[PDB]
Write a protein that binds this ligand. Sequence first.
Ligand SMILES: c1ccc([P+](c2ccccc2)(c2ccccc2)c2ccccc2)cc1
Ligand SMILES: c1ccc([P+](c2ccccc2)(c2ccccc2)c2ccccc2)cc1
Ligand SMILES: [Mn+2]
Lengths: 130, 130
Amino acid sequence: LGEVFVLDEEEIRIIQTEAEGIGPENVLNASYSYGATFSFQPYTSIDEMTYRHIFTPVLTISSITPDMEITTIPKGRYACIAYNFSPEHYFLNLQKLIKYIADRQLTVVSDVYELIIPIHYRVEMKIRIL
Amino acid sequence: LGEVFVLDEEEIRIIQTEAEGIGPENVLNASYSYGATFSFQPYTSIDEMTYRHIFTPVLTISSITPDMEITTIPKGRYACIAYNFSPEHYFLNLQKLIKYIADRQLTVVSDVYELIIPIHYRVEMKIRIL
Ligand SMILES: c1ccc([P+](c2ccccc2)(c2ccccc2)c2ccccc2)cc1
Ligand SMILES: c1ccc([P+](c2ccccc2)(c2ccccc2)c2ccccc2)cc1
Ligand SMILES: [Mn+2]
């Protein structure tokens, strides 16, 4: 609970649209469940991190347009890590992840998965590994 | 062989980048294995169809940048259909697909998958269903 674990998760159907380049930073500033994903880069700066796809999970056939893609989070082995949301935690949690990966010398096979759940906020990043 | 079938396929890791809006049409004109994907819309016109992601499969850890995403084609049930490439076939093959789906009243859960393989060209569209 605030550390990384490794488990065999289920698939999770979800629907997405693109990120337009908006970044995590972009979302923590200005005055106006889902998730989003990004490249598993050896990061340094939220100024550097920039989202790739933004998503919401399904709860529902039919429903969409072509600007959206019905898809899912592959079943598989995910190095995972959970944390109550805060900002000094956000980046500092990503770090533990990338660290753990480089330490275990594991090989990654997907983008990073950011999952926020308004615990009215809970958060988790899972990456897919072998 | 030139008709649709339904089978339980394996996953297929692949790497992608975006389509920029280029469309199938865009690729059949002008003078200068992989695939690409698009929204399972009730189509009419290649003038209307416009690619979403363009991809290549893996044969190879490491390898990329952030403008590319290591990902895959989920294992699952895919209504599939194969055809030697021609142009009058391209759109006319998509049709059989969408038809078959509406006829079987199946429910789709992914974008359409276009797979070209330079048989030096073989081609297939698979969609994921339940
Ligand atoms: C563009 C528009 C909205 C969001 P987001 C979101 C932020 C960070 C990670 C994933 C998603 C959001 C979150 C918190 C406050 C404002 C906006 C967002 C989008 C759709 C549904 C829920 C949340 C993101 C980019
Ligand atoms: C932009 C640049 C290149 C391709 P494509 C391709 C076309 C149609 C469907 C999938 C992929 C290509 C195909 C045939 C002739 C020219 C270009 C392409 C891209 C990368 C690797 C192989 C093929 C597409 C868009
Ligand atoms: Mn995309």
